[PDB]
């Protein structure tokens, strides 16, 4: 099949892109906060049942040694973007022998979203991403949506509990936060919207600092949860 | 809604039936075979007095011994006649002799049937007229890719009328004058306008010389007056 599935409608709307954006906005909550010396991203990972192994569920991904991401929406669709992003980072190192800037990686991702809104025989991706990283121009946090549009943010949230989280961050955010105060703020913002008890096993956290991106282990995250 | 390859419940392909309807809305064309010669003729039908009638020829040469008259969609017909020309020259190239009229009819039908690639059949029927070792001949091609030999035939809007005039007057044994005359008679009847000498085309291929001759305006008038 080689005809288009996404088309214009009488008032100028592309409805499959809206429907895909509705699927992204019903995923579980993820967020991100940019400090003056790094970035933190976090996400809920609740399982449906205790017969599921918690450890293996991943909501936060490494894309390369300096940059990582999280998502809300349809997980299997996110895996396709994570594989394409990893590949682009390595291809950039082979050609220039330095790390791909986050601005260039986001544009690469955005153009892959745009193709699935126009090519024949395909529907759009049903997930939004948060991308966080460090390069020569500093620390960055971006959001990308199913249309392919992207924005740079100081703090933001995606998914179900995303409006209340964004109101809570607007109050508590300051331009002069250290990285450790940002990890505190991020974990406090999740707790507000969380249904049940937040544990180090049902949440996941990643951090950019000193030019490197790293997932927290369960043990590291427990120390931060006992202080909040 | 229903595709290009679909059969109807009585076993016909729909797109081929419709292409045959488009031919019945054409300008009228006809041919008559005698033992001496074969004759072809067409209603021109120009849209205004501002058109140069030269530019609207409905009778084309394929090679020295064969000519064609077309009915239905003119631009589709030009694709077929270009193919017939290229085939008749390939035959001379390879075998150093003229191509037979029946073989040229056959080649044109093998192009006309390759759709399902092309989106639709050609909306065209040709009458091909020529001379080879079997004498003067007249063949018809049609959008189903069938070809048939005839003694006299007409195609287009006035076709049904002209097959009643043929079923009265045509015998297998006429002369060049009686056929030239029967042609301009049938045209006068089934036309819309009044029949001048710059409003129809005529051509002959005679057994004697075996070359195709397209009649001028001067020579057509002698045939109007003889009426």
């Amino acid at each position: 099949s080689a005809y288009g599935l996404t088309t214009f409608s009488p008032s100028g709307r592309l409805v499959q892109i809206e429907y895909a954006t509705t699927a992204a906005s019903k995923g579980t909550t993820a967020l991100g906060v940019k400090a003056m010396d790094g970035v933190v991203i976090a996400a809920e990972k609740k399982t449906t049942s205790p017969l599921a192994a918690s450890l293996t569920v991943q909501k936060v991904f490494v894309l390369d040694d300096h940059v990582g991401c999280t998502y809300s929406g349809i997980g299997p669709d996110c895996r396709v973007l994570v594989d394409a992003a990893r590949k682009a980072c390595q291809k950039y190192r082979l050609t220039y022998h330095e790390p791909m800037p986050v601005s260039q990686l986001v544009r690469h991702i955005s153009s892959l979203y745009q193709e699935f809104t126009q090519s024949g025989g395909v529907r759009p991706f049903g997930c939004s991403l948060l991308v966080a990283g460090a390069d020569s121009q500093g620390n960055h946090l971006y959001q990308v949506d199913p249309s392919g549009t992207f924005w740079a943010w100081k703090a933001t949230s995606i998914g179900k509990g995303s409006t209340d989280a964004k109101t809570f961050l607007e109050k508590r955010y300051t331009n002069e936060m250290e990285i450790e105060d940002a990890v505190h703020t991020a974990l406090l913002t999740l707790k507000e919207g969380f249904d049940g008890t937040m544990t180090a096993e049902n949440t996941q956290v990643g951090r950019v600092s000193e030019g490197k991106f790293e997932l927290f282990t369960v043990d590291q995250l427990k120390d931060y949860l006992d202080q909040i | 809604d229903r595709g290009v390859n679909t059969f109807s419940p009585e076993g016909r392909i729909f797109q081929i039936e419709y292409a045959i309807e488009a031919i019945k809305l054409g300008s009228t064309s006809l041919g008559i075979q005698t033992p001496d010669a074969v004759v072809i003729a067409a209603e021109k039908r120009v849209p205004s007095v501002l058109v140069d009638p030269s530019s609207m020829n409905k009778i084309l040469e394929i090679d020295y011994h064969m000519g064609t008259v077309l009915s239905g969609m003119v631009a589709d017909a030009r694709i077929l006649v270009e193919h017939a020309r290229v085939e008749a020259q390939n035959h001379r190239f390879t075998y150093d002799e003229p191509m037979r009229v029946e073989s040229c009819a056959l080649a044109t039908c093998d192009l006309s049937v390759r759709f399902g690639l092309m989106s639709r059949p050609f909306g065209v029927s040709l009458l091909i007229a020529g001379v080879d070792e079997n004498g003067p001949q007249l063949w018809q091609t049609d959008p189903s890719g069938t070809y048939t030999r005839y003694d006299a035939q007409a195609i287009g809007a006035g076709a049904e009328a002209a097959q009643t005039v043929f079923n009265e007057i045509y015998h297998r044994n006429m002369t060049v004058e009686e056929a030239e005359t029967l042609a301009v008679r049938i045209l006068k009847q089934v036309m819309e306008e009044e029949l001048t000498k710059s409003n129809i085309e005529i051509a002959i291929v005679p057994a004697s010389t075996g070359k195709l001759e397209v009649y001028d305006q001067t020579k057509i008038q002698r045939i109007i007056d003889r009426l």
Binding site: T95, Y96, H97, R107 | -
Partner: protein, 204 residues
């Protein structure tokens, strides 16, 4: 030899917060001279100069391809490329023609605007780099040039002293070579400015 058909030579040297890069002016067809005004240096941006030697048709073709990629880089990335990334780019373009090569041998000099660190590179014709901290040379009088620099260069020269050493090395080597000469052109690059000078030489 295809690499010696057209003539020409290039040298670059490092100092304290500066470099100097120098080329000859000759263009030929084996022993015939076509022109005496063809320097072989290309300014890429304020921080980087490329010298190209080898067959002249491949110098002109390869430098046009490099300028085209650099223009698209600036629009995509919204910044100037730096010296280490530029040399990696050039090495990747040469290796793409591994089994049907461009007959050129690049010399690259750059200075990091922020730190004041100098970076030199020379490549063979399929892209293998060598990155010393003193000098690099290529072209028809490469063997002589390589020995003049080993004798005259020393650490920690300022712009004007380093200029004198590079000019003398280029003129002594060209006087023992039939295929390079007719004076030289030099660029002197610091963090703050870029100077260019025309050096007088022999006319044979």
């Amino acid at each position: 030899s295809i690499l010696t058909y057209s003539g020409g030579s290039c040298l670059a040297m490092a100092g304290d917060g500066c470099f100097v890069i120098v080329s000859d002016n000759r263009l030929g067809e084996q022993l015939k001279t076509i022109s005496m005004e063809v320097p072989k240096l290309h300014v890429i941006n304020e921080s980087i100069v490329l010298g190209l030697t080898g067959l002249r048709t491949d110098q002109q073709t390869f430098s046009e391809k490099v300028r085209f990629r650099n223009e698209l880089y600036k629009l995509r990335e919204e910044r100037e490329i730096g010296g280490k990334a530029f040399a990696a780019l050039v090495s990747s373009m040469l290796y793409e023609a591994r089994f049907g090569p461009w007959f050129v041998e690049p010399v690259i000099a750059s200075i990091d605007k922020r730190t004041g660190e100098v970076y030199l590179c020379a490549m063979d014709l399929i892209g293998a780099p060598c990155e010393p901290e003193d000098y690099v040379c290529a072209g028809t009088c490469a063997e002589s040039l390589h020995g003049m620099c080993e004798a005259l260069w020393r650490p920690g020269l300022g712009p004007e002293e380093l200029f004198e050493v590079a000019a003398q090395a280029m003129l002594s080597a060209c006087d023992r070579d039939s295929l390079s000469g007719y004076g030289a052109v030099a660029a002197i690059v610091t963090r703050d400015k870029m100077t260019t000078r025309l050096i007088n030489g022999r006319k044979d």
